[PDB]
């Protein structure tokens, strides 16, 4: 069906910035709602969102390993004779934030969310739509925990992830990817960590129903491989849980351990659910075929006027809908009523509200669904109450 084609005013691309989206108002509306949902959860689940820089001195990248492993994918420039790069990952700035002041063990775990803009270089010809972009924002958060806290942190992540996915009807599958041949930890770290990942997995999924990919871990840590399935039965990688034993060392991260004096290093968990906002929108656009659910739709309500006489009343309905918080439009024109309705359905509006003489006199709306079902005439108060519930509950169509 086409992420890009479905640009009935969601997003576009221009040759002056290939790989970077232009999000039109209706497009933005979706992006923002997704952010608002993720943020509502972050607050509920113990995360604090932080803001970080976008350009850094190459020295940061040297420390991280990005200079070694990633440089080809980065936008590199000169500042005052010094090499600088646009950030491809938030994952190092987050470490600096954690090192800002000394941390005690009781504090674990610290969870920082970052919605910052990332850049990765890709060849211009290679770029298409939102699937392969230069510019994106991850729903990134990087979690710092004690070694004993891994199972709970992972378990908690899985619920968060599941909770989100459930909202959209999206399926997932989990595997454990274990230590590779070239790997940088001590054995002790890997065993404790993998054991916990297993434990979390056998609690979340239960003993039997998860495969292991032995030796498929990152050099820097063990991971749980997540794959998601859309309604067309395509698979995407959106979610991650990746442990990192390297980054804590490189940035010299520590927490004071009760009796200390001494200190220990935290484990870092790089994690995401959307993967990026850009990527997730692309998935959803196709997954719903451009028929979004009422909460996330940028075209929630359309008012259609029966005749010129009821047009002012329509503007009244629209005002009320807008104040109540809805994305609402009004047809307004001399077009035939049947036409107006059909067009609105074509536009994908979740609800069409026809207002005639009856509605005006009784302060009500006559409601038609996207699917052309005939919900009842309802009063304005009743309609608003209905929409709120749909919104609040994040109800699906199906």
Binding residues for Zn(2+) are: 91, 140, 142, 270
The interface region with ligand 2CR, picked from 194-202, 236-244, 285-293, 342-350 by CB under 6 A, is 236-244
Residue (142 or 348) nearer to Zn ion, CB: 142
Out of 246, 300, 350, 366, the only residue in the binding site for ligand 2CR (CB under 6 A) is 246
Q: How far is the CB of 84 from a copy of itself (least distance, A)?
A: 8
Diameter of the chain by CA atoms?
80
Out of 91, 282, 303, 304, the only residue in the binding site for Zn ion (CB under 5 A) is 91
Residue (78 or 188) nearer to a copy of itself, CB: 78
Residue 374 interface partner, choices ligand 2CR, a copy of itself, Zn ion, none, CB cut-off 5-8 Å depending on type:
none
CA distance 221 to 324: 48
Residue (18 or 65) nearer to a copy of itself, CB: 18
Tell me if residue 384 falls in helix, strand or coil.
helix
Residue 240 interface partner, choices ligand 2CR, a copy of itself, Zn ion, none, CB cut-off 5-8 Å depending on type:
ligand 2CR
Residue (159 or 237) nearer to a copy of itself, CB: 237
Residue 54 interface partner, choices Zn ion, ligand 2CR, a copy of itself, none, CB cut-off 5-8 Å depending on type:
a copy of itself
CA distance 211 to 371: 41
Report cis status (omega within 30 of 0) of the bond before 261. Answer: yes
Tell me if residue 396 falls in helix, strand or coil.
coil
CA distance 213 to 101: 38
Of 297, 290, 208, residue with least CA distance to 5: 290
Instruction: Identify the bridge partners of residue 104 per DSSP, sorted by sequence position.
Output: 256
Q: How far is the CB of 137 from ligand 2CR (least distance, A)?
A: 12
User: Dihedrals φ, ψ of 11, to 5°?
Assistant: -155, 160
Residue 313 CB partners (closer than 8 Å, separation 6+): 305, 355, 359, 360
Residue 64 interface partner, choices Zn ion, ligand 2CR, a copy of itself, none, CB cut-off 5-8 Å depending on type:
ligand 2CR
Residue (77 or 163) nearer to a copy of itself, CB: 77
CB atoms under 10 Å from CB of 354, counted, come to: 23
Q: How far is the CB of 89 from Zn ion (least distance, A)?
A: 5
DSSP strand pairing (223-229 vs 240-244): antiparallel
Out of 46, 65, 109, 180, the only residue in the binding site for ligand 2CR (CB under 6 A) is 65
Tokens 């129903």 -> residue: 209
- Please report, in range form, the residues annotated as the binding site: 91, 140, 142, 270
Tell me if residue 280 falls in helix, strand or coil.
helix
Under rule CB under 5 A, residue 270 binds Zn ion: yes
Out of 194, 225, 230, 244, the only residue in the binding site for ligand 2CR (CB under 6 A) is 244
CA dist 154 → 55, 151, 166 (Å) = 31, 5, 18
Of 120, 155, 243, 266, residue with least CA distance to 193: 243
Residue 131 interface partner, choices a copy of itself, ligand 2CR, Zn ion, none, CB cut-off 5-8 Å depending on type:
a copy of itself
Exposed, middle or buried: residue 66 (CB in 10 Å: 0-12, 13-18, 19+)? Answer: buried
* b/e per residue 101-120 (b: at least 16 CB within 10 A): eebebeebbbbbbbbbebbb
Of 187, 109, 104, 204, residue with least CA distance to 148: 109
Question: What is the per-residue binding string for ligand 2CR in 270-299, x denoting contact by CB under 6 A?
Answer: x-x---------------------------
Residue 57 interface partner, choices Zn ion, a copy of itself, ligand 2CR, none, CB cut-off 5-8 Å depending on type:
a copy of itself
User: Dihedrals φ, ψ of 143, to 5°?
Assistant: -100, 130
Question: What is the per-residue binding string for Zn ion in 224-263, x denoting contact by CB under 5 A?
Answer: ----------------------------------------
Interaction residues for ligand 2CR, span 78-117 (CB under 6 A): 89, 91-92
Instruction: Identify the bridge partners of residue 223 per DSSP, sorted by sequence position.
Output: 177, 242
Residues annotated catalytic, as ranges: 91, 120, 138, 140, 142, 223, 270
Residue (277 or 367) nearer to ligand 2CR, CB: 277
Residue (98 or 294) nearer to Zn ion, CB: 98
- Please give the size of the binding site for ligand 2CR, defined by CB under 6 A: 17
Alpha helix segments (H runs only) across 211-302? 246-250, 277-287
**Binding stretches for Zn ion (CB under 5 A):** 91, 142, 270
């Amino acid at each position: 069906h086409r992420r890009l084609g479905v640009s009935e005013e969601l997003f576009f691309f221009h040759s002056l910035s290939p790989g970077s989206g232009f999000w039109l108002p209706h497009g933005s509306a979706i992006y923002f709602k997704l952010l608002k949902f993720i943020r509502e959860q972050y607050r509920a689940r113990g995360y604090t969102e932080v803001i970080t820089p976008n350009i850094f001195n190459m020295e940061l990248w040297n420390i991280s390993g990005h200079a070694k492993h990633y440089k080809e994918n980065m936008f590199v420039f000169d500042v005052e004779g010094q090499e600088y790069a646009l950030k491809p990952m938030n994952c190092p700035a987050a470490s600096l934030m954690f090192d800002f002041r000394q941390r005690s063990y009781r504090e674990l775990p610290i969870r920082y969310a970052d919605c910052g803009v990332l850049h990765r270089n890709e060849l211009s010809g290679a770029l298409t739509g939102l699937t392969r972009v230069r510019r994106f924002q991850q729903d990134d958060a990087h979690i710092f925990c004690r070694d004993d806290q891994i199972k709970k942190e992972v378990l908690d992540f899985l619920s968060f992830m599941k909770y989100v996915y459930d909202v959209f009807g999206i399926e997932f599958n989990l595997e454990l990817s274990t230590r590779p041949e070239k790997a940088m930890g001590e054995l002790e770290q890997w065993e404790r960590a993998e054991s916990q990942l297993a434990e979390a997995l056998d609690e979340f999924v239960g003993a039997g129903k998860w495969v292991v990919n032995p030796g498929d871990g990152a050099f820097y840590g063990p991971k749980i491989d997540i794959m998601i399935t859309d309604a067309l039965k395509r698979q995407h990688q959106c979610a991650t849980v990746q442990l990192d034993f390297q980054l804590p060392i490189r940035f010299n991260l520590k927490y004071r351990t009760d009796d200390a004096d001494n200190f220990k290093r935290p484990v870092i968990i790089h994690r995401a659910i959307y993967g990026s906002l850009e990527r997730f929108v692309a998935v959803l656009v196709e997954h719903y075929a451009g028929k979004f659910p009422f909460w996330l739709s940028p075209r929630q309500v359309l008012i259609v006027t029966v005749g010129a006489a009821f047009v002012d009343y329509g503007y009244e309905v629209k005002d009320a809908m807008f104040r109540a918080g809805f994305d609402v439009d009004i047809d307004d024109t001399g077009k035939t009523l049947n036409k107006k309705i059909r067009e609105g359905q074509m536009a994908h509006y979740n609800f069409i509200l026809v207002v005639g003489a009856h509605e005006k006199e009784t302060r009500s709306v006559n409601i038609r669904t996207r699917d052309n079902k005939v919900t009842g005439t309802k009063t304005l108060e009743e309609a608003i109450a209905m929409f709120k519930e749909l919104e609040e509950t994040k109800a699906a169509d199906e």
